[PDB]
Write a protein that binds this ligand. Structure first.
Ligand SMILES: Cc1cc(O)nc2ccccc12
Ligand SMILES: Cc1cc(O)nc2ccccc12
Ligand SMILES: Cc1cc(O)nc2ccccc12
Ligand SMILES: Cc1cc(O)nc2ccccc12
Ligand SMILES: Cc1cc(O)nc2ccccc12
Ligand SMILES: Cc1cc(O)nc2ccccc12
Lengths: 219, 219, 219, 219, 219, 219
C-alpha cells in the first residue's frame, strides 16, 4: 500500500502477512456473504493495483466468481478507455504517461508507474479507481450467490420475531435491496411475511411504527 | 483512524487487521451483551466516520439490530440538521464546507472531508459525534436483547449468594438501570429476591450495609 | 495510555486490541485469583482513567465484584474530596481546573482533561491515583473470593510436601497475609499442618530452617 | 528485505518471523496449488536473493519440486551469463563488481554485495531478477502437479452449474491456460462439458453470453 | 523495560502483553525445567526491578518456589547492604539517592528512582543486579525440582543410545553439573550407565572419543 | 540483535518474544530435519553471541545434540585461538580488547563487548563468526540424526514416482550430499532405485533428461 510514514511523506510499504492471511481466511470462512465486501475494502486501504491483484489472486477457490470478476473489470477498463483515451507513441523522457484501463487494473503497468500516479500532485488515484471496479464486480457476485428470494423469508409459527427479522434483513442485504426499500419494507413485506399472531399484533400498531416498536410488540 | 504520528501531527492511518478481526469476533462471541459496547468504543478509538461504518458493516449477522441502528442514526442525523442547518449552494473554492447529519454518518462525505474536519483547528469532531449516535443506538439494542426482567432474578434455595448477585447485577446492567438504582438496589430488591435463609441474615444486618458486608454475611 | 513517542514527548495513544483482549481473557481464565492483580497493573501501564474504565467495563461477568469495586472507588473518591476540595464556580479561561474524586475516576472528566493533568509539569497523576483505588478494591475482591482458610490447608498422608507447600502459600496469598506472616509461617503453621512423618522430620531440624531446607528434608 | 525506513532511505531489514512462518505454513497447507505463487510473490516483497533462498530452503517437504526449481534457476542463470558476461580478474578497489547468474541466485554473492546492487543508483535489481526465475520455476511445478486435464472436467447430472464452473476454472488455472483461452472457453469447452439440461439451456442463449449470464441461466 | 528509542536515548517502555503472556505460558507449560531460566532472562531484557517483580508476581502456581525465591532475594539484598551501606538522613534536594538492597529488589524504590539509576551516566544497573539475584534463586529451584539423580539414568536394554544420552544430559542439566563434569562424563559415567552391548562397543573405542564418535559407534 | 534503527545507526535491540517462541516451536515440531538450519539462520539475523546462546539454551530436549554442539564450538574456538592469538595482560584504558574464541562464543565476553565489536568500524563480526560455528555443528547433528541411507530409498511397486523422488531428495538432503551429487544422481541412483516399470521408461529416455522430463515420463 501507499502510506504516510512517521514524517508525513507518501511511500510504498509491502503488504503485510497479517493483511494477506486476513483476506484469505475471510474468503475461506464467509465466501461471498455481503459482509465480505466491506472487509475487502478495509483490508485494501491504501492499496496499489498490484496489491489489489495480489489479494484477488491469493484466493484459491471460487474460480467461477474470479472469472466473473475479470469480466467486470474488463468492462470497466473498456469504459475508462472510452472516456480517457491516451496518446499513442513515445513517452516524453522522464515524464509520467497517462494510464489506460489495463494500467489501472495493474496488468500493463509496473509498481513504479503505479506509485508515480498515486503520489503525483495531485494524485491520479489508480488504486481507488480499480478498487471501485472490483467492488462493482464483487457486488454482482454477492447478488448471484444469494441463495433465497425475500419472498421466501417468512416467519415460522414458533420462530421468535427477532430471528425472523434477522433472516429477512440478511436476505435483503445479499439481494442488494436499496436502503429506501430496506426502510420501506418495514411497513410492508416484513408484516406480510410475519406469522399470523405477530401479523395481528403488527397490523394493530398502525402505520409508521419503527422497527424497534415492531420488535417490542412481537416479543 | 486519526493518530498522532511519532512527531506530533494528526494523520490518517488505515484500520488494522487486528482491530477489524477483534470487533467481528467480539460480536460473534458476545452478540449484544452490555460489555460489547465499551469494547466497540475502545476498538474505535480515533475512528473516522468511514472507520465506524466499516466496523458496523463487517458484522454479518444481527441484521435486525443493524437496521434498528440505522434508524437511530437517521433520527440523530435529523436532529443535527435541525440544530445546525448548512448553506445551500456552492462551496467557497478551496475551503471546508459544514457537515450535515449524513456527512457525520459518513454516507455523503468523503474520507478526505472527514480528515479535514477532524484535523481542523479547532477540530469538528465528526468521528466522536457519530460514535455517540452509534452508542445511543447500540444501548437501545442491548436493552432490547436483554432476555430477563430484574423481577425474575431470585436466589435459588441452594444457590451461593455470590452467584445470585452476579446474575442480579448482570441483569440490571443489560436492562440499563441508572447507577443510582444499582447503588439503591442493595437496600431493597436484592434482599427481597434473596432466598429465605440469606434474606433472614440480610434483614438482621440492618440498613446501610455495603454489598461487601452483605456478601460476607451470606457466605 | 500516555507514552513517550520515539522523540521523547508524552502523548496519548489508543489502547491496543492486544491489551484489551489480554485483560478480558485473563479475567475469563483466572477470575480473581491473586495473580490477576499484578497482570491488571501491568496491562494498564500508562493508562488514563478512561483506559482503566474501559478495562473494567469490558469484563462481562463478575458483576457482583464490579459493583463492590464501584463502592470502593466511591469511598476513595470521597476521601480525595475531603483532602483536596476544589473551588466552586467558573474556570479561569484556558487554564486547568483541579480534579475532583469523580474526575480521577473518569466519570466527570474528559479525555482531554485527563491528558492535560497527566502531561502537566509536574504531572497530576490521575491515572496512577485511580489505579491505586482500583487495586485497593480488587484486593478486597481477591480476599472475598478466596475459598479456603489457611487453617484448613493440611498435608495429606500421601501428599508430596512440595504439593502441600504450594497449596499453603497459594492460600496465604489469596487470604492476603502480610509478608511478615508468610516469612514467619515457616516456623509454625506450615509445620503444624504437615502430615505426621514430615512433621517429625521438620520438628528435628530445629528452628531457623529455610523453606529450601524444610523442602529438602521432606523430599 | 530492503525497505524504506521512516525517513526515506533504503536499508536492509531482517526477514520477520511472521513472514517465515506464513510461507512455511502456506506450503504445508496448499502445496503447489496455483494460488501459492502470488502468495510467495507477496511474502517476498522487497526480498534479497538471500531472503528468497531462505524462503525456499525453509520448506521441508516437496524436495522433488525443489530439485526441479534448482534446475530451472540454473538454466536462467546460464542464460543471464550468456547475455551479461562479466570481466575476469581483480575488482577495482572499493568499487562494485557486476553480478553473475550465481550472484543473482545468491550462491556466490554476499548479503553485502546484494544490498550494494539493490541500493545502487540506479538499482541493479538482483532480488527482482531472481524472483522472476523462481516464479518461472514454480509455475512449471504448478503445471506438473495439476492432477486433472480440462477434458475431464464435466458437470455431473446433479451438480450445481456453479460448482462445475468452479472446478473448471480451478483446473484451467493449474493447467496454466492463457487468459485468452480462459475468456474463450466460455463459448466452448465450458458448454460442451456441461450436463445435458444445462447444455440445452446454454446452447439456446446463443453466442456472446457473459459467464454471469450463463451462470444465471443454469441456476 | 528501558530501551533505546529510534533516536538513541534510553527511555522507559511499558512491558508488552506479548512478553507478559509468553512468560506466564512458559511457566505453565514447563514449570522449572532448566530451559525456563534462559527464557526468563531473554524475556526480561532491559527490565526494571518493577518489571522483574511483575513477571514473578504474574505466576499463579508454584508458590512454594516463589516463597523460596523471596528468601534468596532477601539473602542477596542483605549481602548488598553489607557491601554498600547507604547514608541515613535526608536526600540532597533534586539529587539521586544510593540504592539499598530492597531498592534493587523494587520493594522500596519507585519506578522513577529505578529509571534514574538505570539511565544515570554511568548507569547503576539495578535491573541487571536484581536479575542476577533472581536467576541465582531460580537455579536453586531448578535443582530442587530435578526429579532424578544421574546415578539412576541407565540405558535400557532396547533403548536407542541417542535416547539414553538425551535423558542423561537432560538430567545433568537439571542437577546443575558444571560444564567440566558434562565434558568429563563422556569418558565415564555415560559409559558405565550404558547397556551391556553399547558398553562393550564404547569400552573398545578407547579413551578420548568425542560424544559424536560414541553416538555413531552405538547407532 | 544489532539493527539499524529508523535513522541509520546500528544499535542493540532485545530479542523478541516472537523470535524466541518461533525457534523453540520449530525445534519441537521438526527436531533436526535439515530445514531447521536455514530457519535458525533466519531467526538469528543480526544476532549477538548472547542472542545465539539464548536461542540454543531455550531448547529443552535434544540434550545429546546440544552437548555435541558444545563440542564442535569448542573445536572451532580452539582453531580461532590458533589463528588469532591475543595479548596477555592489561587492556589499554578505554580501548577495545581482541576477542578470543570463548569471547566469540559468548561465554567470556559481555554484551557490551559484543556490541562494541559488532559496531566497530570496520565491524569484528563476532555474531556471524559464531553463527558459522553453530551451523557447522548443527549440520553434523542433521547428518547424525538422518535415519536412512540413500541406498535404501527405492520406489515401491505402486508408489507414484513423484512420491519416490520426494523421499529420495529428502534423504539426500539429510545425508548432506553435495549439490554436484544431487544434480548427478538423476542420471543414476534415482533410476536404479526406481521400480521396474518406471526404470524401463527412464532407461528409454536416454541420458541428459531433466528431472522434470523424468517426472513427466513416469507420471
Ligand atoms: C485484472 C486482474 C489481474 C489479476 O492479476 N488477477 C485478477 C483476478 C481476478 C480479477 C481480475 C484480475
Ligand atoms: C449510516 C450507516 C452507514 C453504513 O455504511 N452502515 C451502517 C450500518 C449500520 C448502521 C448505520 C450505517
Ligand atoms: C468509576 C467506574 C466507572 C466506570 O465507567 N466503570 C467502572 C466499573 C467498575 C468500577 C468502577 C467504575
Ligand atoms: C539457488 C538456490 C540456492 C539455495 O540456497 N536454495 C535453493 C532452493 C531451491 C532452489 C534453488 C536454490
Ligand atoms: C522482592 C519480590 C517482590 C515482589 O513484588 N514479588 C516477588 C516475588 C517472588 C520473589 C520476590 C519478590
Ligand atoms: C558456547 C555455548 C554457550 C551456552 O551458553 N550454551 C550453548 C549451548 C549449546 C552449545 C554451545 C553453547
Amino acid at each position: 500500500p501507499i502510506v504516510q510514514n512517521l514524517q508525513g511523506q507518501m511511500v510504498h510499504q509491502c503488504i503485510s502477512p497479517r493483511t494477506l492471511n486476513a483476506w484469505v481466511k475471510v474468503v475461506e470462512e464467509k465466501a461471498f456473504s455481503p459482509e465480505v465486501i466491506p472487509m475487502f475494502s478495509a483490508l485494501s486501504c491504501g492499496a496499489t493495483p498490484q496489491d489489489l491483484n495480489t489479494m484477488l489472486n491469493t484466493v484459491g477457490g471460487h474460480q467461477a466468481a474470479m472469472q466473473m470478476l475479470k469480466e467486470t473489470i474488463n468492462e470497466e477498463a473498456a469504459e475508462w478507455d472510452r472516456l480517457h483515451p491516451v496518446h499513442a507513441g513515445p513517452i516524453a523522457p522522464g515524464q509520467m504517461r497517462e494510464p489506460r484501463g489495463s494500467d489501472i487494473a495493474g496488468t500493463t503497468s509496473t509498481l513504479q508507474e503505479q506509485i508515480g500516479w498515486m503520489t503525483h500532485n495531485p494524485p491520479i488515484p489508480v488504486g481507488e479507481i480499480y478498487k471501485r471496479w472490483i467492488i462493482l464486480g464483487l457486488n454482482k457476485i454477492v447478488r448471484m450467490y444469494s441463495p433465497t428470494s425475500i419472498l421466501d423469508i417468512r416467519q415460522g409459527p414458533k420462530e421468535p420475531f427477532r430471528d425472523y427479522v434477522d433472516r429477512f434483513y440478511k436476505t435483503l442485504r445479499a439481494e442488494q435491496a436499496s436502503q429506501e426499500v430496506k426502510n420501506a419494507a418495514t411497513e410492508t413485506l416484513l408484516v406480510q411475511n410475519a406469522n399470523p399472531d405477530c401479523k395481528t399484533i403488527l397490523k394493530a400498531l398502525g402505520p409508521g411504527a419503527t422497527l424497534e416498536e415492531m420488535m417490542t410488540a412481537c416479543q
